[PDB]
Design a protein around this ligand. Sequence first.
Ligand SMILES: O=C(Cn1nnc2ccccc21)N(Cc1cccc(Cl)c1)c1ccc(-c2ccc[nH]c2=O)cc1
Ligand SMILES: O=C(Cn1nnc2ccccc21)N(Cc1cccc(Cl)c1)c1ccc(-c2ccc[nH]c2=O)cc1
Lengths: 306, 306
Amino acid sequence: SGFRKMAFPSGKVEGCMVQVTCGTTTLNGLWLDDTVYCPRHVICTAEDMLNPNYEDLLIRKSNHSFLVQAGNVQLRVIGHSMQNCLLRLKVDTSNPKTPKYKFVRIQPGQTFSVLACYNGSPSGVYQCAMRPNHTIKGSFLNGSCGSVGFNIDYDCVSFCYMHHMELPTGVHAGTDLEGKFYGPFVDRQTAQAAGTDTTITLNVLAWLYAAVINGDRWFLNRFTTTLNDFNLVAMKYNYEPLTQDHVDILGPLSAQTGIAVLDMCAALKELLQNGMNGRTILGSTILEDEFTPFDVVRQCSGVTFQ
Amino acid sequence: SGFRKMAFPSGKVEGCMVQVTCGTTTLNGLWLDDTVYCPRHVICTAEDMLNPNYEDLLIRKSNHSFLVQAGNVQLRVIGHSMQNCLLRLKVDTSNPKTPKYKFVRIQPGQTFSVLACYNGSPSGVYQCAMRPNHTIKGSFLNGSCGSVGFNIDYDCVSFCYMHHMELPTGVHAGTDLEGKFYGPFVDRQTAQAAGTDTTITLNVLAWLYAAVINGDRWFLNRFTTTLNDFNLVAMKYNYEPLTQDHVDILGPLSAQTGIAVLDMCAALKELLQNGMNGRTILGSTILEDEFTPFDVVRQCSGVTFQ
Ligand SMILES: O=C(Cn1nnc2ccccc21)N(Cc1cccc(Cl)c1)c1ccc(-c2ccc[nH]c2=O)cc1
Ligand SMILES: O=C(Cn1nnc2ccccc21)N(Cc1cccc(Cl)c1)c1ccc(-c2ccc[nH]c2=O)cc1
């Protein structure tokens, strides 16, 4: 029993974190096989951030413009290239701690673990969601750029995020491990801001199923809803519209608890309209949206507490 | 910016997790140097849990009654002894991944990271507090016994918890790494229940200082309080009494934000009496008590957003 915002064990990723220095500028990088990946803003001075031409900044560097430190070991850079908003540094040594890995581009609403790093040293791990507005509500200080997000499946690390920026509202923006930003953001100083965000409906439904699995039914009711009537309520409360694909994804949870998806939707409509009236769900007074249906199945018992 | 329930990176502990089997009974153990530590209930059948005499159950075992599996490697047991509610197994191999470590007995209100394990395989990591009632609000399923809690300080792992039991209210009980239970609990079937719990006052004050560091002052007020007048309010709301020692611990946070501790206490008295009136603090609608003053300093900027 219990339900916590659980991260994946971080060891497989800790063994891949290094420090990358170009002159006075330092941040973190990810060392897989004989390549180091890092934010391309490592080649900038603070003043270069105002309006950098990365092509122009990079052609002015050599291999030896870059220092890579792995623990107390200097790695020699033997090649370099830009890939979208990342630099790829070829190094003289393959990382002997390289796990089985993949690079994946996650979708909005999906969750991942972040390993917060400073100076190539891991400091902490926590679980995030990719918001609908393509930001993450992380916890990062200056020096955290190049920190990575990931999932683990059967000893394979799926890297999905590399940290680049804190936006003016204190949320975070970054790239996949091909250096494409999540959302409309750019690695230069502009008036860019986080767009309006929405609650991840699918995740709130998954977490209601988690509270039932764990033995709580108080918020259920005798009503059902149509998807259209649910979505008129969602629009009012700044919830993502629910789709048939979302209903289908909730099938396994529905089957484990014997609660039809649209009957769970009816419960959520009533929670949104009426509020929680001093009650909690899995220890929370608000409707949590940072657990996917997959996260609930990973963490909860396969046996409902009936 | 941001504030998250952050765990310590788990790698140093992942490298120490093994599986311990005595007949049909399996759980996790911790492999440091040439010793494996695990809950002594590994020597029980399910029926033995009703009223086990561990001295009597153990004298009936040999070294070869115990199988220890580290990945796909069988470790041979060459000695065994009971230490309070743990078994200590001597093995033929020193763990080459043993980190610098210590065993510490933490105090109520202090936090640690849990590495949830099944069959000697780590599955997840999350941060907990030791409740005043000597339980943790973990997330554990059957098979999780022998999972450990820890802190990390400068590459030294301080082990503080080993998982033994889920109590009837779905919270968790365990031991230090000398096998002494936290709280009044015993490793046998009794009517034992979690005692009444209280909110960790010190931690709520630390988290209010975190919200100020991160740039939020909305809940502050022009009042001050005495420690006695604060504690009459604490008694009413099931908060731990605040002590002078707690005031002294908050000195560094007070100094960083320029808010006197008793002025922060006055803010908390007003939040308890009036509620949050639809507002949030660091994204929360409730007063969070699972961050210590040390956790706030670790995670937050050394520079207040003034
Ligand atoms: O948000 C960042 C870096 N950040 N990432 N999480 C953070 C959390 C807290 C504080 C800062 C953080 N920005 C701003 C930015 C502006 C424009 C484009 C981008 Cl992509 C990022 C940043 C600021 C300074 C520098 C810099 C470059 C060269 C030498 N020295 C430096 O400081 C780099 C990035
Ligand atoms: O709470 C546990 C084991 N637990 N720990 N977190 C859990 C989370 C979810 C479910 C069970 C969990 N109890 C109960 C208990 C009773 C009396 C004393 C203690 Cl100390 C623990 C437990 C139940 C069964 C067995 C058992 C022993 C031998 C062979 N097979 C078995 O199943 C061991 C412990």
